[PDB]
Design an enzyme around this catalytic site. Structure first.
Site, mmCIF file in Angstrom:
data_model
loop_
_atom_site.group_PDB
_atom_site.id
_atom_site.type_symbol
_atom_site.label_atom_id
_atom_site.label_comp_id
_atom_site.label_asym_id
_atom_site.label_seq_id
_atom_site.Cartn_x
_atom_site.Cartn_y
_atom_site.Cartn_z
ATOM 1 C CB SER A 45 -28.585 -12.667 14.062
ATOM 2 O OG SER A 45 -29.078 -11.919 15.199
ATOM 3 C CD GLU A 143 -40.884 -10.312 20.228
ATOM 4 O OE1 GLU A 143 -40.913 -10.090 18.997
ATOM 5 O OE2 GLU A 143 -40.693 -9.414 21.077
ATOM 6 C CE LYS A 209 -26.633 -11.113 11.130
ATOM 7 N NZ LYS A 209 -26.326 -9.807 11.778
ATOM 8 C CB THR A 210 -22.415 -14.483 14.089
ATOM 9 O OG1 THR A 210 -22.381 -13.097 14.447
ATOM 10 C CG2 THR A 210 -21.087 -14.870 13.446
ATOM 11 N N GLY A 211 -25.243 -15.273 14.791
ATOM 12 C CA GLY A 211 -26.454 -15.067 15.561
ATOM 13 C C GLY A 211 -26.371 -15.761 16.903
HETATM 14 C C1 LIG Z 1 -28.078 -11.800 16.098
HETATM 15 O O1 LIG Z 1 -27.019 -11.359 15.769
HETATM 16 C C2 LIG Z 1 -28.322 -12.218 17.539
HETATM 17 C C3 LIG Z 1 -27.589 -11.661 18.640
HETATM 18 N N1 LIG Z 1 -26.638 -10.735 18.470
HETATM 19 C C4 LIG Z 1 -25.940 -10.330 19.705
HETATM 20 C C5 LIG Z 1 -24.848 -11.334 20.040
HETATM 21 O O2 LIG Z 1 -24.130 -11.814 19.138
HETATM 22 O O3 LIG Z 1 -24.663 -11.681 21.224
HETATM 23 C C6 LIG Z 1 -25.391 -8.860 19.599
HETATM 24 C C7 LIG Z 1 -24.714 -8.449 20.924
HETATM 25 C C8 LIG Z 1 -26.560 -7.869 19.296
HETATM 26 N N2 LIG Z 1 -27.573 -7.864 20.363
HETATM 27 C C9 LIG Z 1 -29.247 -8.139 21.642
HETATM 28 C C10 LIG Z 1 -28.683 -8.581 20.498
HETATM 29 N N3 LIG Z 1 -28.463 -7.178 22.152
HETATM 30 N N4 LIG Z 1 -27.426 -7.002 21.367
HETATM 31 S S1 LIG Z 1 -24.196 -8.698 18.269
HETATM 32 O O4 LIG Z 1 -22.971 -9.312 18.707
HETATM 33 O O5 LIG Z 1 -24.753 -9.074 17.000
#
Ligand SMILES: *C(=O)/C=C\N[C@@H](C(=O)O)[C@](C)(Cn1ccnn1)[SH](=O)=O
Ligand SMILES: OC[C@H]1O[C@H](O[C@H]2[C@H](O)[C@@H](O)[C@H](OCCCCCCC3CCCCC3)O[C@@H]2CO)[C@H](O)[C@@H](O)[C@@H]1O
EC number: 3.5.2.6
Length: 265
Positions: A45, A143, A209-211
């Site tokens: 993300s 993906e 911004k996290t991922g």
């Molecule tokens: C980018 O942010 C990647 C994942 N984000 C998830 C996470 O941090 O665990 C979320 C829960 C969003 N996401 C399938 C990503 N199904 N929900 S969120 O916390 O950004």
């Protein structure tokens, strides 16, 4: 807490995974801490900040408007679209899409924006155009979060990402207003921002911004600093660890704690 570098090491030992990290002065680019800074890590993300930097570049050039309303269909939606799924009837502006992608983790908003910049190939070309010869996006949401072992797709390096973020936020490649907009989107993160502040000592600034991805992939690109100032860029990526999300969150927080306790370096 121990010194930053010692904590980073402790984190790899506890997670059985690789940690990639860069701590850099936002104003000058001075690199303070670097660990596996030239190794590849899935962006997940976090790529969305670069994505919206490319969108802002188009706006600056007059080839895009943050006001422009995009109308999309339900079939265009992908997994996790908390904001975009609510506007199938009225659409969303380009600026709203960037806010949704960055502050709410909206995946469909990200894909819509990605299409406007020429897709994964277009964003990668943009990275090459600003001097980042390492970062690459190859796929779309969701993906791009696959994080397969040894897969170079959709990756960056801590050093590359920090340098690129600094270029977008301060190098004047983007207009003054655009740099301010990109910064405010990170300040407005609703996913991790509030939580981080709740545990940050008083006086510490945070924008981020996290991922997250498969095989324990986790990461964060942030601006942090005492006296309520965005003093440093801090990029931390984790990969190939079987640890729970909670423990991965704890380890990253631990690295932050070490920085906080030993800031004057
Ligand atoms: C980018 O942010 C990647 C994942 N984000 C998830 C996470 O941090 O665990 C979320 C829960 C969003 N996401 C399938 C990503 N199904 N929900 S969120 O916390 O950004
Ligand atoms: O002496 C330094 C400080 O030590 C503690 O602060 C603790 C705090 O109680 C804890 O909640 C946090 O964990 C980290 C909280 C933030 C986690 C995310 C940080 C991000 C920032 C962006 C890059 C990745 C890490 O650590 C600090 C430092 O020990 C005290 O509570 C505080 O009074 C004191 O000012």
């Amino acid at each position: 807490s121990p010194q930053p570098l010692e904590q980073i090491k402790l984190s790899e030992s506890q997670l059985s995974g690789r940690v990639g990290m860069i701590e850099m002065d936002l104003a000058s680019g001075r690199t303070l801490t670097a660990w596996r800074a030239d190794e590849r890590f899935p962006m997940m993300s976090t790529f969305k900040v670069v994505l919206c930097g490319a969108v802002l570049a188009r706006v600056d050039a007059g080839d895009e408007q943050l006001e422009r309303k995009i109308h999309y269909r339900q079939q265009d939606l992908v997994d996790y679209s908390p904001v975009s799924e609510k506007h199938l009837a009225d659409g969303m502006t380009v600026g709203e899409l960037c806010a949704a992608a960055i502050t709410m983790g909206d995946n469909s908003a990200a894909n819509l924006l990605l299409a406007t910049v020429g897709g994964p190939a277009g964003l990668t070309a943009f990275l090459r155009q600003i001097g980042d010869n390492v970062t690459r996006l190859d796929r779309w949401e969701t993906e791009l979060n696959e994080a397969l072992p040894g897969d170079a797709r959709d990756t960056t390096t801590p050093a590359s990402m920090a340098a690129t973020l600094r270029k977008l936020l301060t190098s004047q490649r983007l207009s003054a207003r655009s740099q301010r907009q990109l910064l405010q989107w990170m300040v407005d993160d609703r996913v991790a921002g509030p939580l981080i502040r709740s545990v940050l000592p008083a006086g510490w600034f945070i924008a981020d911004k996290t991922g997250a991805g498969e095989r324990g992939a986790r990461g964060i690109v942030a601006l942090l600093g005492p006296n309520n100032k965005a003093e440093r860029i801090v990029v931390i990526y984790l990969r190939d660890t079987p640890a729970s999300m909670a423990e991965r969150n704890q380890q990253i927080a631990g690295i932050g704690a070490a920085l906080i306790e030993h800031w004057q370096r």
